[PDB]
Structures are given as C-alpha cells and as structure tokens.
Design a binder for this molecule. Structure first.
Ligand SMILES: *[C@@H]1O[C@H](CO)[C@@H](O[C@@H]2O[C@H](CO)[C@@H](O)[C@H](O)[C@H]2NC(C)=O)[C@H](O)[C@H]1NC(C)=O
Ligand SMILES: *[C@@H]1O[C@H](CO)[C@@H](O[C@@H]2O[C@H](CO)[C@@H](O)[C@H](O)[C@H]2NC(C)=O)[C@H](O)[C@H]1NC(C)=O
Ligand SMILES: *[C@@H]1O[C@H](CO)[C@@H](O[C@@H]2O[C@H](CO)[C@@H](O)[C@H](O)[C@H]2NC(C)=O)[C@H](O)[C@H]1NC(C)=O
Ligand SMILES: *[C@@H]1O[C@H](CO)[C@@H](O[C@@H]2O[C@H](CO)[C@@H](O)[C@H](O)[C@H]2NC(C)=O)[C@H](O)[C@H]1NC(C)=O
Ligand SMILES: *[C@@H]1O[C@H](CO)[C@@H](O)[C@H](O)[C@H]1NC(C)=O
Ligand SMILES: *[C@@H]1O[C@H](CO)[C@@H](O)[C@H](O)[C@H]1NC(C)=O
Ligand SMILES: *[C@@H]1O[C@H](CO)[C@@H](O)[C@H](O)[C@H]1NC(C)=O
Ligand SMILES: *[C@@H]1O[C@H](CO)[C@@H](O)[C@H](O)[C@H]1NC(C)=O
Ligand SMILES: *[C@@H]1O[C@H](CO)[C@@H](O)[C@H](O)[C@H]1NC(C)=O
Ligand SMILES: *[C@@H]1O[C@H](CO)[C@@H](O)[C@H](O)[C@H]1NC(C)=O
Lengths: 812, 814
C-alpha cells in the first residue's frame, strides 16, 4: 500500500547521482514496491522553504505553523551552551570567566583574560553567519574570525550604540568560528552580548518541525516563527496566538500565562503636573507604564489620592514668568520675577541653567533602557518633582533610566578664546544625590558631535548631596547623559524603586542661545582686550598686569584677576601661565648658588616596574615630563592608542601601557601637572609636601632643587587633585640627560594615591661653578719664583661656569 | 535479471539504520526488483580484507592481485604533491617548499618554515603512520596534529641506521596534519625525507582496486601488493611477477623493462689482491657489483687484463711480517719498522695506537659500507677498496652514492703524564691524507661518534683538494666511530664520476688499547707517572720540577726541553702546566713605573653583538664569554649549546651563536674556543705574531698605554689557517663602572673583521694605574703670617685609582 512504504534517497555515488527508493515502514512488511527513480545531486537547498517532499521532486512550501529553518541551523535559545559550542578561557581563576549563558542572550567575561566561544561546523556548501552582537563597553575587545579547514586565520568588531547585526561569508571546508573577548584595553566592566547565531549551508536538506510553543507561523513557508506578542497565549504548532485571559498576563513570547500579581506601593511614581492657568501645581500619581499587576485584586493599594494644589516653583534663571516658563530675549538677566535688560557695557551670560523643575526643558530628553534585553523603550525615565528631578520606575529593577541633556554649541567668551593655552570651552555641574541601598550605578557619559559615548564618571552606592564639574575641551554638539540603574541583579519585578537618584540642578555655561542670570561687568570698548590685559568695569580700558602675575581667563574682572607667580617662576609674554626659565638661583649667607637646567628642557620619559595584576595581565605605567624653558608651553602630549588600534597637554603626564605582546597599547592618559606652584629648596610649598624620606639621602649636602607642580582636575579618589614634585639632584658623574627615578618603596607611581614624586639625578642640576668654588694656594717665592695656581676642588659639585685662572708667576 | 540490477545502500538515517536496495543498471530498466533488506550500521571496516560485496553482508577477501587498501588512504607516489596535500612555506621561500623529489619527498634546506599540511575528515578514530628520514639536525622536524577545534610529542627524533617509523593516534574530528621543518638550529644543509603516509579510518568502506603495474599480490586479501623484485616484469593486476628477459633489466618495482646499456670503462674499479704465499700480489679488476650493463653487446670494453705480479707493500708499523706474508700484530711491548718488531727495554715504553699506512687488506677495525642516493639505505657491500699506496674510493650503485669508510677504536689509554694534568683536554688524535681528484659537487665527510653516540660531522670538505691532512683531538675516552663519506655528486641522475676519486694515504690514531707501536718512547726510570709538573730525562731516571716561568707540555714530556718559558706578564701555576696572569701588570717608564691590578675584572663577563639579519628572515647575534685573569688561571668560561637538548668548551674567551628565542619558541649553538692560551700581556701592539690594530678602536684621550692581552687558540680549521687569535684591549676610564664596558670593533658587527681574530676592548676604572706616590700635586707655601700649608692634592686630570692615600695637609711654623 502507498501508506505502507515511504520513499527514501540512496547514498551518493562518486558521480553524485542518487536514487529515490520506496522502503516499507516495517522490515520486510510487503512486496511489490515501486521502482527507483533518479533525483537531484546534493544541492537541493530551498532556503527556508525546504520541505523537500520525496513524492514530488520539488521544494513544496510546508504547512502553516512550522518553522522551516533552512539549509542551516539557528541558535536563538541559549538556556545552556548549545550542543557543539565550546567556551574556553585561557590566562596569558578564569574557570568562571567563560561566556555565561545568561538567557536568550549570552554574556562575555568582565575580567581581563581570554574567553573564546568556539563553534566548528562542517559547512557542506558555502554559507554565512549572522551573529547579532551588543558591544557597549570599549574595555573588552571583541573580534570574530573564522578559520578554514587548514586552520588558517576584518576580525576586529565595531563598538555598538543605540544590538547590531553582522555577516561573514564561509567556504565549504570545516569552518570554525571564534567569538573572543579580552578585557585588557583599559585595565580600569560591562559584558558583551551576542544572540541569534545563524549558520547556513550545513545540511543540504531539512524538514520543517512544528513551531515552538510561544510562537506562531500564520503564513506557510515562513523562514522563522513570529515571536508572540505580550499577554497572549500560544501552544506549539498553533496557527496564531490565542489571546490570554484578563487575570493572566504573559511576557513577550511566553507560552504559559501567569496570574497578574497584587499591586504594591512600589509600583507608583509621583510627578508634578504642568502648571495650569491658575498656577497651582498638583502632585500626580501614575502607574508604571509596563503595568503587570491588578488593582481589583485584594491586598493591593489603590491609586493614592493626588491633586493637592501648591504654588508652582518660580521660573528658572533666564526665563520670563499664562504662568508658563519661556525664555526672554537675550541681553537681559532674570532673577525669576522678570528679566531686567542689561546695559550695553555689561556682558550677557551664555549658557543653560536648570534648577526648578516644572517640566522637562526643550533640550532635556528622558529614555528608559531595559536590563533584560537592552533596547531603548524611552517611555519616561526621569520625572520632575519641583525641587529635584526624580528617577522614574522602569519596566524592571535592572533598567537604565537615562536622562540626556544635549547642548549643540558653546560660545567662548572673548577673553578666554584669546589665550590658546586655556583649554576650557565650557563646564557642567549637578547635585547627584542618591538614596540608594545596594548595587546601583549612576553614570555621567559625555558624547561630543555624535562621537561614541565615553563614561566621564561612574558613581556607585549610596551618596550624598554632592556635585561635579567637567570642563568641556572642544566645541561640539555634546550629549550629556545620566544613567541610573536600580540594581545589577537580574530578578523578575520591581524591588528597589525607593532607591532613587536625584539631580537638584544641572548648570551649564557658555552655550549658544543661552539664557543669563549673571550680567558680566566688562570694560567698555565690552570687547576683546589684547592678550594679557586685565579688565576694570569702571575704567573701560585694557591694561597689562604687572610682572610676575598671570591673568586667569575664566574671570578677568577687576584688577584682582591676575595672581602673582610662585617662587622661582616668571610670567610669559602673554602673561597667561607662570613658567620657569631654566635657571634657578638659591642664595646662602656665605655664597649665592646659580643653576641652569637648559640641558633638561627637553621632554623625558620613564616607565615604572612592570607589576602584575590579580589576573595574568601585567601593567607598567609610562610618565612623560617637561620641566623648564620653551616659553613654558606644555611640551608633553600624551595619547591613547587603544581606541585607534585622549590627548592631554601637561608638564608631567602618566599613561598606563598594556604590554605589546598581550595585544599582539597605551591607556588612561591623565595630566599629573598643569601648573607650576613654585620652585624652591623647601620641602613644603603651598600645601604640596615632597617627602625627603622617600628617596635616598643626599651625600653632597647641598640642597635638592624641588619643582612643585599641581593638577587642576578633581576626581573621586583625589579630593584636592594630583600634585607632583620633581626633585633635582646634583650628580657630577651621571649623564647630562640624567636619570629619572620613581620612589623605591612605591613603584606603581602613587603610594599616596594622588602625588607623583620624582627624582632627576644629573650633572645639569649641579650649581654653576662659582668664582669662589676652587682652591687658592699661594707661595711667596721659592728660589725667587711665586707659584700661586688655582685648582678645582676634588669634592666637585659644580659644572660649567667660570674657568680655572691660569697659573700665576711673578718674581718677588 | 540478477545481472540487470546491483544492490546499493541507502542514505544513513538519524538512528544509523541503513537499507540495502537493488537498483537497475539502466534508469528504469525493468521491474520486479528484490525487496530491501537491512544492512550494516555505520562503521563496518574490514581493514584490508574489505571487499564488502552487496550479496553477502560480511566483508570478503577480494581477488588475488588486487590491493584492498583499508578503511583509510595510503599516499605513496609523490610524483606530484597528491591531491589535498598543501605545501605552505613562510619566512624568496617560494621555492623553499617540500619538493616532491620522487618516491620520497624532501624538506627545505634554507632557514625558513616549510609545512606539509593535510586535512582529513577522519570518520572513525585511526592512526597516521609516516616513515621519515632525519639525517641532519640543523633542520628541526615536527609532526603535530590539530583537532576539529584547531587546538594544538611534537618534536621528532634524529634518525640513524636508515629510515624510521612513527605512528600517532587520531580522533573522529576533522584532523589536520602538519609536517614542519625549519633549518634554524645551527645557522651553518641536508633535507628531511618522509614516505608512506598511511591514514586509516577515512571512509568506513573501500572497494578492492586492481594492484598497480610493477607490483604483485599472489595472496588474496593482500593489505598492499608487494613491489616487484628487480629485473622482473609485472603488469597491473598480475597474480605474480613475470621474469624479464636477459637483454632487458628493470629496477625494483618497475613495470616496464629497459634494454641493458652497453658497458663502458667507467663501470670498473681496480683493486690489489691479498698477498699470496708467494708474496707477489696482483692488480685485479671487478665489474660494478650492481651490474646493469652487458659485455656481449658491441661497443663495450671487456674486463681489462689483470694479474701483473708485483711485490706486496711491507706490513704496517706494528705488525710483524710472517713467512706466510700475512700482516698481523706482534706482541705488546715492541716496535716495528716493517722488517721485524724489535723488543723494547723496560726503560722505554710502547706507543699505544693504531697506524694504517700500507693497504693490502682492510684491517680488522676497518669496515666499508655503501649508502645509496636513491633510497638512502645502507647496502654496505664494498665502498672503499685498497690500492697499496692509497685506499681507493670504489664505484657505488649510483652516481649519488655515499661510499662510507668507517674506523672503530675500542678505547684510548692516556699516557700517565697526560692524565696527571686535568687541564689538558687531549685523550687521542687522528690524521689522514685526504686527497681528492674530484670534478664537481662532491663532498668528503668526516663524522665522529664516540661511545656509540650519534654522528656529528666534525669536518666537511668540498670540491677538488690536494694532498693534505687533518688532526682532530678526541675530547673523551670512548668507543669512537671515525667515518669517512664520499659522494660523487649531489645531482640525481647511471654513473659518470668514477674518475673523481677520494684517496686516503694514511690514517694515524694514537692512544688506542691493544694498539701497535712504532715509536718506543723514552721515559725516566722509576717509567711511572711523575709528580705533577715534573720534566722527564731518559738518562736521569728521576722526575724534576721545571724552573719558574716555564710550563710543561703534557703531550711530549721528553728531555729538559719539554717545558717552555712563559710569555711576558704571565707566571706559571702550581702544577706548572699553563701560563696564567695574576691580576697585575707592571709597566715601567723611564720617569716612573706603573702598577695595575685587575682583581675586579677576574670574574667572567659576557657580551652580545649587534643582531645582524641573514639573507633570509632569520637574524643572528653572537655571544662571547670572557675570562681574563686570576683564579689560578683556570678557564672559567664554560659554553654549551642549548639546542641539542631543546658541546661544552672550556676557554678564556668563547664565541657561541645565539639564535633568537622568539623564532624557536623557547637556542644557542655552534660553541667554539676563541682562546686557549695566554701568549703574553704587553703594551706592544704586536706579540708573537698576533696583531691588535690601533685603527679599529677609538684613539685614547688619556695618552697612557692600553694593555693588550694576547690570547691564541690551538684549533686549526678550514677558514683559519693558523688558528683564532683574540686580543682583549684594556683601557683606563675613571668614569666607567668597575665591572666595565666591553665593546667589539665598530667596523665589523659580527665580531671579526679579518675572519679569525676577535679583538675586544674593556673600558673600566680597574684598568687604570694604581695611584702612585708621585701621581699628585705638591704645593709648597711660604709661611704667610708664620703658617706653612704645603697641602697635597690629587691631580685634576686624574687617571689613577686605588693605590696610595692622599697625604694629610701640612701645618708647621717657620
Ligand atoms: C644655560 O646654559 C646655556 C649653555 O651654556 C646658556 O647659553 C645658551 O645655550 C643655548 C644652547 O643650550 C644656546 O642656543 C644659546 O644661544 C645660549 N645663550 C643664551 C643667551 O641663551 C644659557 O644662557 C643658560 N641659561 C641661562 C638662563 O642663562
Ligand atoms: C602606543 O603609543 C606609544 C607612544 O605613545 C608607543 O610607545 C613606544 O613603544 C616603543 C616600543 O615598545 C618604545 O620603544 C617607545 O619608547 C615607546 N614610546 C612611548 C612614548 O611610549 C607604543 O609603541 C604604541 N603602541 C602600539 C603602536 O601598539
Ligand atoms: C688587587 O686588589 C685585590 C682587592 O681589590 C687585592 O686582594 C687582596 O689580596 C690580599 C692578599 O694579597 C688579601 O689579604 C685581601 O683580602 C684581598 N682583598 C680583598 C678585598 O679580598 C689584591 O691584593 C690586589 N693586588 C693584586 C696583585 O691582586
Ligand atoms: C641558551 O643558553 C644561554 C646560556 O647558556 C642562555 O643565556 C641566558 O639565559 C637567561 C635565561 O633565559 C637570561 O636571563 C640571560 O640573560 C642569558 N644570558 C646570560 C649571559 O646569562 C639562554 O637563555 C639559553 N636559551 C634557551 C632558550 O635556553
Ligand atoms: C582556582 O582554581 C581552583 C581549582 O583548583 C578553583 O577551585 C578556585 O575557585 C580558583 N580560584 C578562583 C578565585 O576562582
Ligand atoms: C552657573 O553658576 C555660576 C556660578 O557663578 C553662575 O554665574 C552662572 O550663571 C550659572 N550658569 C547659568 C547658565 O546661569
Ligand atoms: C561649533 O560651534 C558652533 C556654534 O554653536 C556650532 O554651530 C558648530 O556646530 C560647532 N562645531 C562643530 C560641532 O563642528
Ligand atoms: C622573490 O619572490 C619572487 C616571487 O614573487 C621570485 O620570483 C624571486 O625569484 C624571489 N627572489 C629571489 C632572489 O629568489
Ligand atoms: C703517528 O704519527 C707519529 C708522528 O710523530 C708517529 O710517531 C706515530 O708512530 C704514529 N702512530 C702510530 C700508531 O704509529
Ligand atoms: C674507556 O677506555 C677503556 C679502555 O679499556 C674502555 O674499556 C672503556 O669502555 C672506555 N670508556 C667507556 C665509557 O666506554
């Protein structure tokens, strides 16, 4: 009978010809089977419609509700590591540092060691791989490279903004696919996620299986089932999703519905309503937008009563108070009642200040990022609360409630733009309060002119009413973004909605089209004064500051603007920065010394002792120094290779250097020195202490010249900012370029954590040979010959300077 | 009909079950086919008993004369790189890939990577059985298999005695096989040969092919049909080889016979017969023993008339002539001039050792063997034949053959005086006349293997040469295998270079147990081991110490003239064996005498030259180890090659070549002794023939003379006629550190501008003179206010160090 036997192909011959043969279902069931007929030759791939019915030698689209795959394999569902996938970790213990199958997505390794996801496939015909990856953090470096059958080697992968797609072509011989991640770029993470692997060409033939539960395929020949929309039921092989009951809610593509939970107080978030014509703002309560709980269920608190009328907060400085806050014309400043017009002489202030929150300003945008799938829903991430701006309730406790301030351009004040040495284009601040309990991370990422976001700061744990001042270094459309995460733990539901960050105000200066609250008093032509000219509002004229004083371009107001230079330094031509001509001059009561470091003016470098990490990676820092001369311009420029695969101008710079062998390599450039506090023989100067105990005691006994630097930047670890001292030591035998030495007891660079103390032993640091630093030996006359000749002192500590006088002979 | 259809297997299912189905030969030929029947599941490999007919499920032995292969694949014919084999070469090395020479494949001689890659989809677990030849150790040959995940006993043994067999297990995954050879061990080659690759487990099933022509399989189910023996005819599929005609000869495993060529005069090699009882030998002619030519063919010269009676050469020194005219050693304790060995007095001593000058027959220790150039196997029949005055180099099977002569010594007895001194490295020597008459591309080899160890080529001569010699000094008592190998040419082609013949006129070896004597040494009477450093006079009969500044030569401690005065600046040690320098020189000028003291420089110091690249991608930088003075003048620089472990020479200066560790993956080799004696220490630039040029190094600013330590090496090589001479120049630098700075000449970075002399320069403060009592300033001061201050102060242009202390200041009232 026709139903008794099922047709079947024969084994391929040398020529590739094949035979289609009827075989009984039971071994030796019956006789009188149909004769064999030839068939296609191993290339019958129908590309996701391949039912490949044996009865008809053609590709017939198969029944609805059945994922047909294709001539390939899909790896969507990563409950565990799918069969054949190898997760290997190697150290250059990382047993736990393998690609963890978190769920529908697999995650990378955060620590600094290799983690390879290996798949070796016998791709019978040429095909492709379509791994869809998420690459947020540039710390981990992520590459995908395929080896041929001979195990022979565009591997490096792009950083992702906004899940990203990729495709690579494959040949027919035993391709092996590597997904490798090593977190060695920064040494400072955030894992890398890949999902939906799609190899093609594996099988030459496939049969369409019933569609997996929780998915539907209404149209026949569907390459893959459509994932079921939320709150809908779906069984395996169903033509379309069946809507679920009201009392039961199902997640996106969930086969089994679950009872809607009882509502709690944690599901609320309170907002201030927009001010009406009456001007009485009312507190309002709104349920979470992805609501899943049921209010009708017993034990669930109803929506709390809201609508208490209270006076609106006054309009922000720069907006004129229909009670709606809107900007008032430029050239005027507002205290809140009404913006008063400025005189022509006084200067308006450009920039945006956001203190009182009645509604999100125009540049403000708020978006939500999910922690389970990492897509930007963007419903409402931060809500206004009048005094502060709240952090709303997300879909889940892992959500990144993202607030973004985007400012297009910064108008530099005329005085600041005049000095090229000044690096400030404008600055931002905040009051990043928190009331967090555990495992939260407030991020403050800055992205200029559509460049990739780089996290300027990342606060963690509970904090207090604080602040932050980032100095923008370039004119660009910046995207100031603040990201709050309730918890790093992955758990179903909302738990830490009470752990709310707050931003009481975000003041930004020097913004084109900005409003003003300060009406700057400037000297009448105000106008750009010539370089290095102080400004008096009443004088209306530009005058040069007195010698040994440097004008601060930030606030060139009054004659008090420019500050006297520190000891041992002289002001440059622009009168902008105190610098040191390469000569120092120390005077003792017996004699006055004189030095000259013009041989040390060139930039010098030093690398610390390579110190291994907790993992197998070893790190050694690199410091670049500029000391004296060259009009006191910062000659040490220090960059970061790793991004290319920032640039800071400073007198001393530190860059971490990952070993070149590991990468197959600089990182974290910082400016250890941005000013010259002073040059003096004293150990302490203006709060910077250079410990004499760190270095070896000086044998000569003459004082050691100490250069006292200081850095402007204030970080989380450094309260007052980095302060570096370069100690100069007189050493006649050592080379003129000298030897640069970090302290012995701490080799990483800062056993204090913020102060980098150096030591420069050279002959240039030795005092200039004075006219009294030699021997006088007088002989009256021996046989009527006066021999008074002058010799250098063998305990020589001087170099250069005056020459030996010629021997003196004069008969008595 | 049964002949109309042939059964066949169906495609394997998920469960592994399979169906056997009869299919008509023609498409739709006829109906009424037999029903399917279940067949074998997955692997059913019969492993060379596999015919696997469809009628019977069991594997059957296929017909005779047919190789059944196995469940794998056999690669045997490398006329071209077989399909699937990849020959990838990386550092032009495009030509430096594995060349398919013929039945065997060869490696790359130059110094760059050459990989033979084969990637196989091994369905079931199996093995790879590659038979390889690894003569030279300069190339390093690795065989390592990568699994399906491309994941990594890689290094392979050296081969002697011919060809060796290796097997490695394999897995089910797609396995790729690497045969990699890089010639980066010694930098000084000889290729590496592999044959008969035999993968198993590839296909789960094979069909019984007919056996290739030129081979036979008489027994059914033969795993591989045997190669046809020589001079026999064989066609494909024949049950057994058919003997070939007399007129046509066929090589081993040759399907088609070839007519025997006409004989030429080049096929002869002449020999001297053994000395008969009459005592008159005769020249004899024997045809080339693997004869392939025909004498009956026209144009071929017959065997030359031989048998001219001439007197046998006299017996070698140490063998007594017999009435039977046969040479045989005579009793120990006597020396022979040839007529008869005269008994020696107890006061004189026999000389242990073997001398071979006159060739009537191969002595007992001699063996001669032939190595073929086509199959590299030791036929061993007769390579070198005797010719009276010289030992000939007879004709091999082919024109690429290695006619190998071997000398074997049981062990060497050190003379009592020599063994007394541990510093002496002499255990035995050797010598030869190594004439040649070669035309092109020959290579006389001299390899030495002691105590049955592996053979290392001590020397390798090439091209035409003349009557010469060589004196290798054996470094240890052992069983040595002195081997000579002569190759007619490197070109692979018949024989045409029978005229170009190496000859060895004499092979003298000293200090051999059971050895015969021709010199009857004179010792002083109790000859017994004299106390260390005692000269010997045969008439005196007493051991006396040599006078100071003289060192006794342990090789020839005869007479009072044995010990030679030491060179300038040196003093003899306690043993009076070697001149050494206590770390102090003393140069005197007419104005003042200097005094140095180098005790800070006694420790061994090292230096590496500037890394210089090869013509290929490899770069080499040398490593020199120096020992200068003190420590009783014992050679503190021991230098050894790493790579052989993956020799050790004691010398004052040693050069070793450091191949970079990155290339090897972990490497120093070619050690040599640049200095074995101290000729003398002097401020003169030339001393006893060693010249240390002043132009090489920068001129001295101080102006005081620079000491030039004058060394010298005993070894004489092909490149160095007189032996390497190294001079260490010491320069006074007050600023330089006490260990000092060591610098090679700037003109030649490799180390030697000349090619044999290594001049160094050591700048340090230790080389500076000791501060003399006259190397400072005296400054008399007449009493000013009745105060005299004649204080003493060092000279500002200081060039001294250490020495006398600066005197205290003077204060005396006038
Ligand atoms: C520091 O020493 C230098 C060298 O003696 C002084 O002289 C200058 O040297 C530089 C090269 O280093 C030359 O280019 C200048 O022409 C030299 N003269 C001057 C006036 O600069 C140098 O003057 C010393 N420093 C000071 C401040 O006097
Ligand atoms: C990254 O950039 C730095 C320079 O900023 C490079 O550093 C040099 O590396 C070489 C090789 O080790 C050293 O010889 C130099 O002394 C280094 N100079 C400095 C200033 O660091 C480094 O090579 C770059 N990394 C790359 C190209 O991978
Ligand atoms: C050269 O210098 C070394 C040390 O710098 C001297 O060595 C001393 O030798 C005496 C005996 O002669 C010992 O008692 C001392 O203990 C040695 N010194 C040290 C530090 O161990 C040596 O004498 C000097 N002169 C010569 C010719 O070698
Ligand atoms: C080959 O041998 C030489 C000396 O026998 C080794 O040279 C020293 O190796 C150590 C460790 O590798 C280094 O720290 C030294 O700097 C090397 N030189 C000296 C003078 O000590 C060499 O390492 C050996 N190479 C290998 C691969 O074993
Ligand atoms: C180190 O390896 C051992 C395996 O012996 C493992 O038990 C341990 O957890 C590893 N260390 C860490 C920090 O995981
Ligand atoms: C930011 O604060 C400064 C503090 O002096 C103030 O002058 C400035 O006006 C503020 N920014 C704006 C845009 O108002
Ligand atoms: C620089 O500032 C101007 C003025 O705000 C702005 O229009 C421009 O886009 C900025 N430069 C860039 C981002 O190229
Ligand atoms: C360099 O390689 C080329 C192949 O591109 C080859 O033709 C040439 O002979 C090589 N050079 C030498 C010196 O062999
Ligand atoms: C080797 O040559 C030397 C030459 O001095 C000779 O005295 C000695 O007898 C020779 N060897 C033998 C074993 O005769
Ligand atoms: C050393 O020489 C003796 C001489 O009789 C010999 O028997 C012995 O085998 C030699 N040493 C070795 C290790 O073979």
């Amino acid at each position: 009978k026709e139903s008794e036997y099922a047709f079947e192909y024969t084994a391929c011959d040398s020529t590739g010809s094949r035979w289609r043969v009827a075989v009984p279902a039971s071994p030796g069931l019956c006789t009188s089977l149909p004769d064999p007929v030839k068939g296609t030759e191993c290339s019958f791939s129908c590309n996701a419609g391949e039912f490949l019915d044996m009865k008809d030698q053609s590709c017939k689209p198969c029944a609805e509700g059945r994922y047909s795959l294709g001539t390939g394999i899909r790896f969507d569902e990563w409950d565990e590591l799918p069969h054949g996938f190898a997760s290997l970790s190697a150290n250059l213990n990382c047993t736990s540092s393998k690609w963890v199958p978190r769920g529908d997505y697999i995650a990378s390794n955060t620590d600094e060691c290799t983690a390879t996801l290996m798949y070796a496939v016998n791709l019978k015909q040429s095909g492709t791989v379509n791994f869809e990856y998420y690459y947020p953090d540039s710390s981990i470096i992520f590459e995908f490279f395929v080896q041929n059958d001979q195990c022979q080697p565009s591997r490096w992968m792009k950083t992702t903004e906004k899940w990203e797609f990729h495709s690579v072509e494959l040949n027919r011989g035993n391709n092996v696919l590597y997904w490798r991640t090593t977190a060695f770029s920064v040494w400072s993470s955030k894992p890398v996620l890949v999902r939906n692997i799609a190899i093609t060409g594996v099988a030459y033939t496939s049969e369409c299986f019933p569609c997996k539960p929780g998915t539907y395929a209404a149209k026949q020949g569907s390459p893959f089932c459509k994932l079921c929309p939320a709150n809908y039921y779906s069984n395996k092989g169903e033509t379309s999703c069946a809507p679920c009951d009201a009392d039961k809610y199902s997640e996106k593509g969930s086969s089994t519905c679950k009872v809607r939970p009882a509502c709690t107080d944690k599901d609320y978030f309170y907002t201030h309503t927009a001010c009406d014509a009456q001007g009485e703002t009312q507190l309002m309560y709104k349920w979470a937008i992805p609501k899943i709980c049921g209010e009708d269920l017993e034990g669930a608190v109803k929506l709390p009563a809201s609508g208490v009328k209270t006076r609106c907060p006054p309009c922000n400085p720069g907006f004129f108070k229909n009670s709606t806050c809107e900007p008032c014309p430029y050239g005027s400043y507002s205290n809140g009642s009404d913006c008063t017009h400025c005189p022509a002489g006084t200067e308006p202030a450009v920039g945006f200040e956001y203190k009182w929150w009645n509604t999100l300003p125009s540049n403000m945008e708020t978006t939500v990022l999910s922690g389970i799938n990492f897509e930007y829903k963007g419903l409402t991430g931060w809500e206004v609360a009048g005094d502060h701006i709240y952090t709303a309730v997300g879909a889940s406790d892992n959500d990144f409630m993202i607030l973004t301030l985007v400012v297009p351009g910064f108008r530099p004040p005329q005085s600041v733009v005049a000095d090229t040495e000044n690096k400030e284009v404008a600055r931002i601040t905040f009051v990043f309060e928190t009331i967090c309990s555990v495992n939260c991370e407030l991020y403050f990422m800055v992205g200029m002119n559509s460049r990739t976001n780089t996290p300027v700061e990342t606060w963690k744990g509970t904090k207090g009413k604080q602040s932050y001042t980032y100095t923008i270094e370039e004119n660009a459309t910046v995207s100031f973004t603040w990201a709050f995460q309730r918890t790093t733990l992955h758990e179903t539901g909302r738990k830490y909605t009470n752990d709310v960050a707050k931003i009481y105000s975000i003041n930004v200066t020097n913004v084109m089209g900005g409003v003003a609250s300060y009406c700057r008093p400037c000297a009448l032509e105000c106008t750009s004064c010539p370089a290095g000219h102080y400004i008096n509002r009443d004088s209306g004229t530009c005058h040069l500051c007195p010698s040994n004083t440097i004008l601060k371009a930030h606030q060139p107001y009054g004659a008090q603007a420019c500050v006297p230079c520190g000891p041992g330094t002289k002001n440059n031509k622009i009168h902008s920065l105190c610098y040191n001509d390469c000569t120092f001059s120390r005077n003792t009561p017996s004699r006055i010394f004189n030095y000259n470091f013009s041989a040390l003016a060139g930039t010098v470098s030093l690398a610390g002792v390579p110190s291994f990490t907790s993992k197998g990676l070893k790190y050694f820092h690199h410091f670049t120094l500029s000391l004296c001369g060259n009009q006191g311009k910062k000659m040490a420029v220090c960059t970061d290779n790793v991004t290319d695969l920032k640039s800071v101008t400073a007198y001393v710079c530190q860059v971490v250097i990952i070993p070149s062998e590991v990468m197959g390599v600089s990182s974290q450039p910082v400016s250890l020195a941005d000013r010259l506090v002073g040059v003096s023989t004293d150990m302490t100067l203006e709060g910077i202490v250079s410990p004499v105990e760190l270095f070896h005691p000086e044998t000569s006994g003459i004082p050691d010249i100490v250069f006292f630097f200081r850095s402007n930047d204030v970080t989380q670890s450094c309260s007052s900012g980095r302060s570096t001292t370069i100690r100069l030591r007189c050493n006649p035998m050592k080379a003129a370029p000298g030897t640069l030495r970090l302290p012995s007891m701490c080799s990483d660079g800062t056993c204090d954590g913020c102060n980098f103390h150096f030591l420069w032993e050279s002959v240039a640091a030795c005092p200039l040979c004075s006219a009294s630093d030699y021997h006088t030996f007088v002989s009256s006359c021996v046989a009527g010959i006066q021999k008074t000749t002058y010799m250098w002192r063998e305990p020589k500590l001087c170099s250069g300077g005056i020459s030996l006088p010629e021997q003196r002979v004069t008969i008595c």
